[PDB]
Structure formats: C-alpha cells, structure tokens
RNA sequence: ACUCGUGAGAGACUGCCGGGGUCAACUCGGAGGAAGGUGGGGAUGACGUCAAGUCAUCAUGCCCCUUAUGUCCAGGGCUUCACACAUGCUACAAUGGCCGGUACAAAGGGCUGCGAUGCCGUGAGGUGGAGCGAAUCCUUUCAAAGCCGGUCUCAGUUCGGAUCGGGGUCUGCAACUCGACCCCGUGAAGUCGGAGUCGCUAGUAAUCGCAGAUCAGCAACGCUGCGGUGAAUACGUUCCCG
C-alpha cells in the first residue's frame, strides 16, 4: 500500500487536489480510498496590537491547517509515475507513507 | 483615532488572496526570512520601476517570484540585463534558484498601490497636494471600473508645521461590507520637510465571485 | 432498532430502542451507581414520566464528553427524542411540558482584557 | 552534587600560590566558587564591579560561594 | 495624609515638592476626611516652537470614595493653585449637602 | 433587562425527595457557590433532622417556619428633599418568599451549631415555633414599617 | 535594535545560553515568536498584508 | 502525658500529640508511630508509660528534639552572622534572606509597621 | 448501523393564524419547529476628539557625538527598602481538614523534541529506551471539584502556610548577589476585615482542574484559551453615573 496524506491551508485547493489524485489513480485504475477529512490544527497567536503601552485591546491571529487523507491500495508503477508527475496547486504538501 | 483595520488584511480569508503561498512545517521561519530579504531586495529598483505586487509561490525549494507592475520595459530593460541581474542577485542572496515572472497590470490607475505610488511620487515633487489628489481621482473612477475612492494625506502638507490630514473621495467605499473587493494601498511621500503618508482605497465592485 | 443522539453542553449520548421490564445500562454501570446525586435521576426519567412508560421501556446507552450533569441533560434529550421515535402522538405531549428542546446555552468565549467572559478587571479611578 | 563548580583560572592560580607557600593579595574577578578547602588562608580581593575587597578565607567559608563575602549594594535610608 | 508625587515625563524640583505640599496641604486644613493623594505631572506642548502645556492630575481617596481631578496650564504652579481651588469647593460640597 | 420592562424568569423544577417548589428554592438559596449537590445534602439532612425532631412531614414544618418568617411590608429608600425617608411598601409573594428563605439561610448561618445541618435544622425548628433570630428580623422589619407608616403615601 | 546587537545575535555565541531569538525583520528583542521568527509588530503588519501564508485574523 | 520535654494535652491523637515537640511534624509522627508500634488513634489519656518509654527512647535515640534543634538552628544562624556572609548581612539588618522582594512585601521580617 | 471527523446542502424569513394598528410601518398572544422575532458568541470601530501613546518594533526631517553619546568582554545592577499605592493569589476553617476506595471532560503540545513498560529511590528524579513528525506513539487508559467510607469536635486547633535550619534533585560554562522543585523539621500574621469600592442578568456569577505561547531552566499566583459543577435577583426609573 501507498498511503498519501496531504496537508494545506485552503480547503478548496485541497479538495480540488484530492479530486486530482482520485481522478488520477481512478483514471489509471486501482482500489483507492476516497478523501477522508482528518480534522485540523489551529495555531492561535495573540498579539498586543500596539507599539506601546496598551496591554488590553489585542488582536489574535489563527492558523488553519487542513489535513486530507487518501489511502492507496495495490500500487502499479503506471499509477505511481503520475504521483510524482504533476502536482497542480503546490500550496499542498504531500506526505507519502 | 480612526482605528481602521487594513482591509486587505480584513478580507484576506474571504476575497483577497494571500500574496505568498506554500506549505511549511519546520521550514517556516527560514521561508519567512527569505521572503523578507526578497521583498527588501525588490523594494528599491522596482519602486523606481513601478512595482505593485510581489507574490512568491514556493514549490519544492526552487522558488517562484512573480511581480505585478505597470511597465514591462523598466523592469525588463535589455532582456536579461535588467531582468537577470536582479534575478541573479535573488539567486545569490537566497540559497536557491529563482524563476522570476514579470507581468503588467491592464490599468495602472486601477490599482490602489499604484495610485499611492503616483500620488506620493508627485507629492515629493513639490506639486500642489489638493491638485494631486484631484488628479489621481476622477480619472481613476472612469479608467476601468471603480466604485470607491478614498485619498487621505497626512503629514507636513505643503511644508507647513501642522500635520493636516486631508480626505477626498467619490462614490461608494464601504469598508464594513466584506463582499467589497477593495484594493488598499498606502505609500509614503518623501519631501525635504518630511514624509507624507498617502492612503488610497479603491472599491471596484459588489462582486463576490465565489 | 431506534437509536438517537442527545447533545448537551459538550457532552453527547447515544441510546437505542428496546422493549422490556425495567433496566438501564450506562457505560457498563447501572443508573443508580452512575448518577449518585438522585436529582439527575429525575432529570433523565422525566421524559419517561411525562408519557408514562417508565417501566415498560428498557434500553442501553453509551455516552461521551461533558461532566456529570451535561451527560444527564443529554440523556434526557435522547430519551425524549427516542420517545418521538416510538409513537409520534407522544410528541405533542412531550414538547408541551418543556422537552424535545435542547438548551443551546454553552460556556461562552473568554474576551481579551477581562478576567473571565463578562468580568472586567476591577478598576479604581483616582 | 555531581561536580561542584571550580573556577579554573582561580584554580590554576590557587595551586601555584600554595605550592610555593606564598600568600599574596589577589585581585579576583570570581564571584562563583570557594570550591575546595585548598583555598583556606589565601586573601581574595573580591570584585563587586567597582573595587576589590580583601577577604580572609577560614575553615567556615567552605560551602559559601566566593563573591558574597563582599556585598554589591549599599543602603542606609536617611 | 499620605502624599505620593510622581512625574509624568519631567524633573521634580524642590520648589515643586514644597509648592505641592502647601497647595495640597490647604486640603488637609479643612477636609479632615482625607486619606491618600496621588499627584502626577505631565509635560507636553514642549518641542514645537511653542509653549509647553503642563498637565497635573490629582487622585484623592477621601474617607470614603475616590475623587479625581485634572488640569492643563501653561505653567505648573498656576495649574496646581487652580486645581486646589476646585478641590476645596467640591469637598465642602461633599461636605455640603445633607443635613436633614 | 430593567428599564425595558419585566424580564422573563426561569421556571424552577420541584424537589425529587420532597416534591415542593419551596424545598428546591431553599436549596438554591443554601448554595454557597459551586456545590449544588452538597447544598442538597445540607437541605435534605437538615429536613430529616427536622423529621426527627417533629415526627411529621418536614415540608409542613418548612412551610410553617417559612410562613412565620415571611414579611408583609418592607421599608425603603426614597429621599425626598434633603431627608432620607424610610418608605413602607407592600411586598409581593415572590419577594416575601425570597426574604423568608434568604433570612432563614443567613441567620441559620450565623447560628452556632457544629455543622450546617444542625444549624439549618435548628433554625427551621425555631422559626416553626417562632423563636429564631429571623422571626425577630421579621418583627424588626414590621417595626420599621409600622414605625414609618406616614411616609408611605407617596404611592410609590 | 542596533546593528551591533542585530548582528551580534546572529553569530555563534561562546555559550549555548547566550543565543536568543531577536526578530529578523526589525531586530526587536522582546516578544519574538518561534514559528514565525517575527515580533508581534512585524507579525501584525505582515499578517495584515497577507505576506505570511495562512495566518489570518481569528474569530471563533 | 509527659514525654521528651513537651507536656502533652488531655485529648489528642498520637500523630498530633507527637507533633507538639519542636523536632516532630506530621510525617515524623507517621514514621515514628509506624516504627515503634503505637496506634496513631490512641488518645493521650489512654497512653501507657511503657509506650512513653519505648517511644521516648526511640525519638531521643534516632532523632533530635527541643534543645538540640534550638541550639543547632541558633548556632547555625549565628554561624553565618559571624563570618560575614551576605545572608549574614540580611540577618544583621533584619531583611529577608532568600533574596526575595523587599520593596513592598516581606513585612514578616521587618515586623510591625512604622509609617513615615 | 450508531457516533465522530470534514465537505456539500436544508433550515428563521414576522413565513403561517388571532388582536391592536391610519389597513402603514410595528407591536401582544398562538401553532409548527432543534431554534422565534437582530436564537448565542465572535471578527467587524463611521466623520472626528484628546497636541492622548510610541523618534526603544520599524521608517524618518532637523539638531547633537565621531576618539566617543560607537564597539568588545569580565564582574555588578535592572531583584536594593523606614515607607505609600495598585492588580492578583492563599487564607481565617466542619458546605471544612486528612487517609482510603471510586466516576466522568474539553481542547491542545511534540526532532537533536514528547519520551512509555521495567529497574533504583520517600520524593523531586536517576538508569533506559518501546513508540511516534503523530485522530495511530507520548502527554498515563488523561483530569480536579464529585460520590462512598473512616477520623478530626470548634480549638489559634489535625485551621493557616508565611518565615527560618538542616538535607537533596534537575537545568545550565555558572544557581553567592538572583532559579524552580522535593524531603525533614520549624509553624508567624490571620476570628470575614473602618471611610469607601468593584464585578456580574445565564451556562452568566461563583468555584474546580487542564493546555498553550515566551522558554535550557524558571520568579507563571501572570497572560491566552479549554472544558466540569453550577446559582440568586431585576418591583421599576424617584435618586447617583455616562
């Protein structure tokens, strides 16, 4: 098995990217698990929004990390070539485990 | 005073895209540092040239630096002579290799950053400031298709001692509406008496385009 | 059969239909040994007392989240919507008494510049 | 108590001082250790930043780090 | 009568200490109700081919609750004089107004 | 929610063991904060000690003490023109039950029994006979109301 | 944020306790974050300009 | 009862009755009463003089008490006040020794308040 | 199949019925419905004010230093203390303390990091490395207040932990001035707090733990968040404040 776990910042780009992976492996023909949402991680960073003394009146900046999963069973190298062949959005990093 | 949040940072989730785009775990502080030194390296000669936008896409450690400007011809002088010099210095300052894409905006008077460029560069050049504000406007409203127009100039206007803010507009510029597609640009004039910070809001349209 | 999901503050409970002489299965425990407070004991059996099928209905439940009382109020909700899922003409009699309606009251967000949510730092102007 | 701190510059100097059986006033930077009882009898000019204070080392000094036989702050109040 | 004297951004001359003591000391005269006084001395206008605007703030916990009181003037002594005139009238009002 | 009119109040469930609005309301006014379960153990234990010292229904003893502390008139506060006037006003039912339970709990809390259960038991019993300090606070409140009857006219 | 200190916090120190963060863009010594390497002011201005990838203004 | 030198009260449990000596707190009571064998729940009225014997010989033998700790603590504080330490200076001036806050608090070392 | 995780979608519009409305807006009740009338909370600060804040985040006009007002290092200081204020935390006990047994969370964090079973300690921890770049491994299967039981009998106490002495562990080149944590002892003030004054209208107040950022270590009782248990009252605008 080749299990692809892809992470990104956009849910739209990771959904169309997962559509590219499902359309790719499904196009070459294999047994493939569809896109599974692993949930998130959020990094919340509270910033005192003042150059000088105003400890109250903050603004806090979050950080969304979207995690999608596609599990690949029964790999054939004509399918494995198209994995390293094209990645379209490139804001997505793909873990191959 | 006016506690107005930067609207490109107020709609950066909804309408306006990020300028820099990648994914980074445990490489992020390095990508930040390279992003900063790249934008400092693209400040000077491109601010002579007419720079508006500096996007950095970043693939598997190549890099892709893309610039939206208002004159392909000052950014690209002799082919490779003006392009590949700043490109090559981006290749040496970063520990990477640079694919520099350079492209023109269809209307320079449409972008709020370039309006702030032309206004503040006129205001360093000893022209009348109310005449300058009026020049940038009116013509901008028609140019392509804008609905909003807010030009605020603070600082030593005309070389006076008091720091008088000015406020000219035309049309509709709603900031609290999030389906606004507002371009925002503040650029700061450099006179001998000081610096005249110019803010320009440009409201293109109602269109979500979701 | 007929399951269900009852959602209180951050708790959640899952029950299922079943006909039998009185039994109550929580997470491996009995109802009198999982809820030792005897007031939540009313707070969950009150939908059974309204449409009076207190003994003629036994089913097991599994839960998650909350504390004691969030799981109690959640299990009230899941019994109630289960009693929709037994007989729909029990449904106007539940909703009339104050039932079938989960309480949307949750612990609200703490606000910056405050000790808690809705609590200012106590300020003595001079 | 794996190994207590030793002041290697003062350690080298102290050994030389006691091998020759010579006693000399020492202008010492070190506020950090009175490590061995080999330091007994040697006069230490402790440096609180601003001047050097002579300190005699006796048997009771073992276990007190060297700097604060000389204090760094001055207070009277009136 | 506990008298705390802070700057804001300013020297605090021995003339300012003594004068502060004597104006504010008027209040010790006739308002026995006093406790703590907190006195804080701002200095802007300065640096601008113009005359410095002083500001004095004074805090006063009476015996009971908390007065505050704020004054802006071209100089410091005239400002603290004025501030004590205001405070004296107020307090006797908070003395005043009552007595059936 | 004042100055907009009357605000809607939360409905209060009755007691499981005893079956009364007034028992549960006594529990929610026993609740030194956080521990409603421990408030229920104090109220329940105190009312079974009242069951021991009466041999009757405890809620009848509770409502008889609640009746014997319940006030009818309360004084207040309006200062017409430079003089503070104690003004007597008719007390609503919920206001009277609130003053009865709140006085009962607080002056049980001043009383010198060992635990809280013996305090609340002895205060419900002494308020049932009429010998607690809380009944003396009812008589002092009607003392201030009847002593200040004339100022009540304002119709306020 | 003097260039002797901006430059001195980037060399190899003679002890490992001596190496501190010091925000890269301006050189601000206090209130520096580790994931960004930016102080709170450069985080706020750069995150407002969309320059940092995917940190955005929060509301839950 | 009577013991090492502390007059025991009328009605206290043993793990509290041992605590009223200068060298013994709660944990030493839980270890002494485990080593010797006296029940911790025993009152002082119900205490046996042979239990005073075995308990007394144990806690004067393998542990120190009133005179040893008062002369030892006193001799160590005056030890560091004779040699000239900075903690000696803190015990001299009547200041907190651990280098803690002296500007507002540390009133338990300065003591009762005089206000100027 | 049930959750749950994250994608798309439906759903609250005075839409439906009754009454007031100038037959207008809108308001009082009812039904359906998970929710009823801006359902709850956020993010969102108009024109301007206050010469408010910041030339120490940064940028900068002008003036000043350039053999120092630059810069490199050791040591010291920013932690001093007769005081006064300010925000917090622990309390003054029985709705409590201490010992034993037992049940339920949410969110988070992790590479020269998080580090398990096992073994050595009384305990901080030591030895060791399973396993994890993590819905998986680790933070124990996660809590504490809760419940069941025993003891304490109102006392300056089995309340309270400040202080001080001895003895340690860990981090670091280095814990003296100046770190935290653990063990033994020590055992002070404090009996609900004058004038006053502050917060809060429902999952709120109150109380209970948990995580995070900064960080080798920590002055964290701070800050930002997460959930647990969970009240009272609002007659009403005369009075104080805006």
In order of their start, the domains of chain D are 1-78 (3.30.860.10)
Would you say B87 and B42 are in contact if contact means Cβ atoms under 8 Å apart? no
Distance of CA B102 to the CA centre of its chain: 15
Distance from C-alpha of H82 to C-alpha of H92, rounded to nearest angstrom: 10
Distances in Å between the alpha carbon of C112 and those of C125, G1, G45, H87?
Answer: 21, 29, 20, 43
The answer to whether residues H66 and H77 belong to one domain is no
The CA–C1' separation of E42 and I66, in angstroms, is 35
Residues H65, H13 within the same domain: yes
Residue located via tokens 């839980």: H30
The residue range of the domain holding H35 is 1-71
For residue E62, is it left (φ>0), alpha (ψ between -120 and 50) or beta? beta
Question: Per the domain annotation, does F154 fall within a domain?
Answer: no
Alpha-carbon span H26 to H28, nearest angstrom: 6
How far does CA C108 lie from the centroid of its chain?
Answer: 20
Which backbone phi and psi does C6 adopt, to 5 degrees? -110, 125
**What Å distances lie between residue B135 and B119, B131, B183, B196, CA to CA?**
9, 6, 19, 17
Which pair of tokens denotes residue B48? 């002579």
Triad H56, H58, H62: Cα angle to 5°: 130
Q: Are residues H113 and H78 in the same domain?
A: yes
User: Both tokens of residue B75?
Assistant: 């950014």
Radius of gyration for the alpha carbons in chain E, expressed in angstroms and rounded: 14
How far apart, in whole angstroms, are the C-alpha atoms of residue B24 and residue B33? Answer: 13
Nearest Cα residue to C102 out of C124, C79, C120, C123 = C79
Residues H59 and H78 in one domain: no
> Both tokens of residue B56?
């950095």
Contact of B201 with B7, CB cutoff 8 Å = yes
Residue C68, Cβ neighbours under 10 Å: how many? 14
Which nucleotide across the nucleic acid strands is nearest to H76, CA versus C1'?
I165
Domain span at residue G7 reads: 1-60
What gap in Å lies between CA E38 and CA E60, rounded to an integer?
Answer: 6
Of D65, D25, D30, the C-alpha closest to D47 is D30
SS3 state of residue E79: helix
The helix/strand/coil state of A11 is: helix
| Inter-CA distances, B59 with A89, B63, D7, E69, G49, Å | 9, 6, 53, 62, 21
Q: Which residue has the tokens 């990217």?
A: A17
Tracing tokens 């006909």 back to the chain, one arrives at C19
Chain A, nearest residue to B61 by Cα? A90
| Domain CATH number, residue H40 | 1.10.8.50
CA of C108 and C1' of I36: distance in angstroms? 22
**Residues H99, H105, H107: CA angle, nearest 5 degrees:** 95
Which residues 6+ apart lie within 8 Å of B193 measured at CB?
Answer: B156, B159
Q: Is there a domain that residue F105 lies in?
A: yes
Candidates D58, D68, D75; nearest CB to H85: D68
* Residue of E38, E37, E42, E46 whose CA lies nearest to E7: E42
Q: How far is the CA of F131 from the C1' of I231 (A)?
A: 29
Among H19, D41, A87, residue whose Cα is nearest residue B59? A87
Å separating the CA of residue B10 from the C1' of nucleotide I15 = 35
User: Cα–Cα distance between B63 and B100 in angstroms, integer?
Assistant: 9
Task: Please say whether the beta carbons of H91 and H84 come within 8 A.
Answer: no
Residue F70, token pair as written in the block: 């319940």
β-bridge mates for residue B184, sequence order = B201
The DSSP output letter for G16 is G
User: Do residue H28 and residue H79 come from a single domain?
Assistant: no
d(CA F45, CA F127): 17
Domain that holds residue E69: 1-99
- B20 forms beta bridges with B56
Q: How far is residue F100's CA from residue F93's CA, in Å, rounded to a whole number?
A: 10
Contact between residue E19 and residue E31 where contact means Cβ atoms under 8 Å apart:
no
* Surface of G (4-43) touching A: CB under 8 A: 31, 33, 35, 40-41, 43
H49 and H6, same structural domain?
A: yes
Between positions 19 and 78 of A, the ones with CB within 8 A of G are 43-45, 47-49, 51, 59-65
Separation CA C26–CA E45 (nearest Å) = 74
Range of the domain at F121: 21-148
Å: C103 CA to I136 C1': 35
Please indicate, yes or no, if residue F8 is contained in any of the structural domains: no
Q: Within 13 Å, how many C-alpha atoms sit on residue B196's CB side?
A: 36
Q: DSSP of chain F, one letter per residue?
A: --SS---PPPP----SSS--HHHHHHHHHH--TT-HHHHHHHHHHHHHHHHHHH-S-HHHHHHHHHHHH--SEEEE----SSS---EEEEPPHHHHHHHHHHHHHHHHHSS--SSSHHHHHHHHHHHHHT-SHHHHHHHHHHHHHHHT-GGGGG--
Could you say which DSSP state residue B68 is in? Answer: E
State the Cα–Cα distance between residues B20 and B64, nearest whole angstrom: 10
In chain G, how many domains are there? 1
- Are H67 and H79 in a shared domain? no
Q: Identify the closest residue of chain C to F39 by CA–CA distance.
A: C37
What CA–CA distance (Å, rounded) separates B116 from B114? 5
What residue numbers of G does the annotated binding site for Zn(2+) cover? 23, 26, 39, 42
Q: Which tokens hold the place of E30?
A: 């006739």
Of chain B, the end-to-end C-alpha distance in Å amounts to 34
Q: Is the dihedral of CA F110, F112, F117, F122 positive or negative?
A: negative
Question: Domains plus CATH for chain B?
Answer: 17-106 (3.30.300.20), 107-209 (3.30.1140.32)
What's the rounded Cα separation, in Å, for the pair A67 and A6? 6
Q: Specify the CATH number for the domain of residue F101.
A: 1.10.455.10
Nearest Cβ partner for D68 among H82, H86, H93: H86
The torsion of the CA quartet H39, H40, H45, H50, rounded to 10 degrees, works out to 50
Residues in H closer than 8 angstroms to D64, CB to CB, are 83, 85
Q: Is F16 in Cβ contact with C41 (below 8 Å)?
A: yes
Residue nearest to nucleotide I219 (CA to C1'): H100
What is the count of structural domains for chain F?
1
- How far apart CA D5 and CA C115 sit, in angstroms, is 45
Q: Rounded to an integer, what distance in angstroms lies between the CA atom of residue B124 and that of residue G32?
A: 35
The answer as to whether F103 is a domain residue is yes
Contacts of D27 (CB under 8 A, 6+ apart): D45, D47, D52
Instruction: Using the C1' atom of nucleotide I197, identify the protein residue whose alpha carbon is closest.
Output: E65
| Chain A residue whose CA is closest to B21 | A91
Instruction: Residue C112: list chain A partners with CB under 8 A.
Output: 46, 56-58, 60
Domain match, H18 and H55 both: yes
Structural domain count, chain H: 2
Q: Which residues contact A30 (CB under 8 A, 6 or more apart)?
A: A72, A73, A74, A75, A76, A79
E strand or H helix at B161, and its extent? none
Which positions ≥6 away from B21 have C-beta within 8 Å? A90, A91, B55, B56, B57, B58, G53
Which chains does chain G touch, 3 or more C-beta pairs < 8 A?
A, B
Task: Retrieve residue B130's tokens.
Answer: 């109310």
Place of tokens 């910033």: A47
A44 in contact with C, Cβ within 8 Å: no
State the Cα angle at F103 between F101 and F107, rounded to 5°: 120
State the CATH architecture for C1-126: 2-Layer Sandwich (3.30)
Give Cα C44 distance to the centre of its chain: 6
**Residue G52's domain is classified under what CATH number?**
4.10.830.10
Q: Residue F123: which residues within 8 A CB-CB, separation 6 or more?
A: F65, F104, F107, F108, F111, F132, F134
Domains of chain A, CATH where assigned: 1-97 (3.30.70.600)
Query: CA distances (Å), B81 to each of B42, B68, B74, B86, B89, in order?
Result: 16, 19, 11, 9, 12
Helix/strand/coil for H93: helix
Nearest nucleotide to the CA of F92, by C1', is: I235
Quick one: resolution in A?
3.4
């Amino acid at each position: 098995k080749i299990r692809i776990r892809l992470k990104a910042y956009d849910h739209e780009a990771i959904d169309a990217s997962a559509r590219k992976i499902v359309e790719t492996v499904t196009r070459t023909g294999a047994s493939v698990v569809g896109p599974v949402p692993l949930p998130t991680e959020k990094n919340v960073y509270c910033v005192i929004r003042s150059p000088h003394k105003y400890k109250d009146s903050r603004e806090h900046f979050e950080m969304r990390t979207h995690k999608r999963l596609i599990d690949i069973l029964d790999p054939t190298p004509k399918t494995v070539d198209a994995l390293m062949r094209i990645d379209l959005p490139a804001s997505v990093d793909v873990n191959i485990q | 005073m006016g506690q107005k949040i930067n609207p490109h940072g107020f709609r950066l989730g909804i309408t306006t895209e990020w300028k820099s785009r990648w994914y980074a775990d445990k490489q992020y502080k390095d990508y930040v540092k390279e992003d900063v030194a790249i934008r400092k390296l693209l400040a000077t000669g491109l601010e002579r040239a007419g720079i508006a936008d500096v996007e950095i896409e970043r693939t598997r450690d190549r890099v892709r630096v893309d610039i939206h400007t208002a004159r392909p011809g000052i950014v690209i002088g002799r082919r490779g002579t003006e392009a590949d010099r700043i490109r090559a210095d981006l290749e040496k300052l970063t520990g990477k290799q640079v694919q520099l894409n350079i492209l023109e905006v269809k209307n320079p008077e449409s972008q709020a950053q370039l309006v702030a460029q032309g206004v503040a560069e006129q205001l360093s050049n000893r022209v009348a400031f109310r005449r300058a504000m009026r020049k940038a406007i009116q013509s901008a409203m028609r140019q392509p298709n804008v609905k909003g127009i807010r030009v605020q100039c603070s600082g030593r206007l005309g070389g006076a001692e008091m720091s008088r803010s000015e406020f000219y507009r035309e049309g509709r510029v709603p900031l609290h509406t999030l389906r606004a597609d507002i371009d925002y640009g503040l650029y700061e004039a450099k006179t001998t008496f000081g610096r005249i910070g110019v803010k320009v809001w440009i409201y293109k349209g109602d269109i979500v385009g979701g | 059969p007929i399951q269900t999901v009852g959602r209180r503050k951050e708790a959640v409970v899952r029950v299922r239909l079943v006909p039998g002489t009185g039994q109550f299965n929580l997470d491996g425990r009995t109802l009198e040994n999982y809820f030792p407070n005897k007031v939540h004991q009313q707070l969950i059996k009150a939908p059974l007392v309204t449409v009076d099928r207190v003994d003629q209905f036994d089913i097991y439940a599994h839960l998650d989240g909350g504390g004691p009382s969030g799981q109690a109020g959640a299990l009230r909700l899941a019994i109630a919507r289960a009693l929709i899922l037994v007989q729909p003409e029990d449904r106007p009699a539940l909703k009339k008494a104050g039932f079938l309606t989960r309480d949307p009251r949750a612990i609200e967000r703490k606000k910056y510049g405050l000790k808690k949510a809705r609590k200012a730092p106590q300020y003595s102007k001079r | 108590k794996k190994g207590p701190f030793v002041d290697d510059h003062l350690l080298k100097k102290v050994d030389v001082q006691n091998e020759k059986n010579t006693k000399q006033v020492i202008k010492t930077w070190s506020r950090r250790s009175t490590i061995i009882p080999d330091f007994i009898g040697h006069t230490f000019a402790v440096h609180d930043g601003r001047k050097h204070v002579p300190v005699f080392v006796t048997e009771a000094m073992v276990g007190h780090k060297l700097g604060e036989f000389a204090p760094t702050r001055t207070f009277k109040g009136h | 009568a506990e008298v705390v004297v802070k700057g804001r951004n300013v020297e605090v001359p021995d003339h300012f200490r003594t004068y502060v003591s004597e104006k504010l000391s008027r209040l010790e005269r006739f308002d026995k109700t006093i406790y703590l006084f907190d006195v804080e001395l701002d200095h802007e206008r300065n640096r601008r081919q113009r005359k410095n605007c002083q500001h004095v703030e004074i805090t006063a916990r009476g015996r009971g609750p908390v007065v505050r009181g704020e004054a802006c003037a071209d100089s410091f002594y005239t400002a603290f004089e004025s501030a004590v005139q205001k405070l004296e009238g107020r307090l006797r009002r908070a003395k005043d107004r009552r007595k059936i | 929610m004042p100055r907009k009119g009357p605000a809607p109040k939360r409905p209060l469930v009755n007691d499981p063991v005893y079956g009364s609005q007034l028992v549960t309301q006594l529990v929610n006014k026993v609740l030194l904060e956080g521990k409603k379960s421990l408030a229920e153990r104090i109220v329940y234990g105190a009312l079974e000690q009242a069951r021991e010292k009466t041999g009757t229904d405890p809620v009848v003893t509770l409502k008889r003490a609640l009746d014997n502390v319940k006030p009818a008139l309360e004084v207040r506060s309006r200062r017409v023109g430079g003089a503070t006037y104690q003004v007597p006003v008719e007390v609503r039912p919920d206001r009277s039950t609130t003053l009865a339970l709140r006085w009962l709990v607080n002056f049980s809390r001043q009383r010198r029994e060992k635990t809280m259960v013996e305090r609340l038991a002895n205060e419900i019993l002494d308020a049932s006979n009429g010998l607690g300090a809380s009944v003396k606070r009812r008589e002092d409140t009607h003392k201030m109301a009847e002593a200040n009857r004339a100022f009540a006219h304002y119709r306020w | 944020a003097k260039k002797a200190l901006v430059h001195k916090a980037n060399k190899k120190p003679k002890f490992a306790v001596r190496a501190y963060t010091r925000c890269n863009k301006c050189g601000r010594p206090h209130s520096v974050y580790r994931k960004f390497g930016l102080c709170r002011i450069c985080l706020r201005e750069m995150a407002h300009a969309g320059e940092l990838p995917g940190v955005q203004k929060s509301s839950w | 009862a009577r013991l090492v030198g502390v007059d025991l009260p009328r009605d206290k449990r043993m793990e509290i009755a041992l605590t009223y000596i200068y060298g013994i707190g709660r944990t030493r009571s839980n270890e002494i009463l485990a080593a010797t064998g006296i029940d911790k729940n025993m009152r002082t009225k119900d205490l046996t003089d042979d239990q005073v014997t075995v308990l007394r010989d144990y806690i004067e033998g393998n542990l120190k008490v009133e005179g040893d700790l008062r002369r030892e603590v006193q001799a160590d504080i005056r030890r560091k006040i004779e040699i000239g330490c900075y903690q000696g200076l803190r015990h001299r001036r009547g200041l907190p020794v651990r280098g803690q806050r002296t500007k507002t608090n540390a009133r338990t070392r300065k003591g009762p308040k005089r206000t100027i």
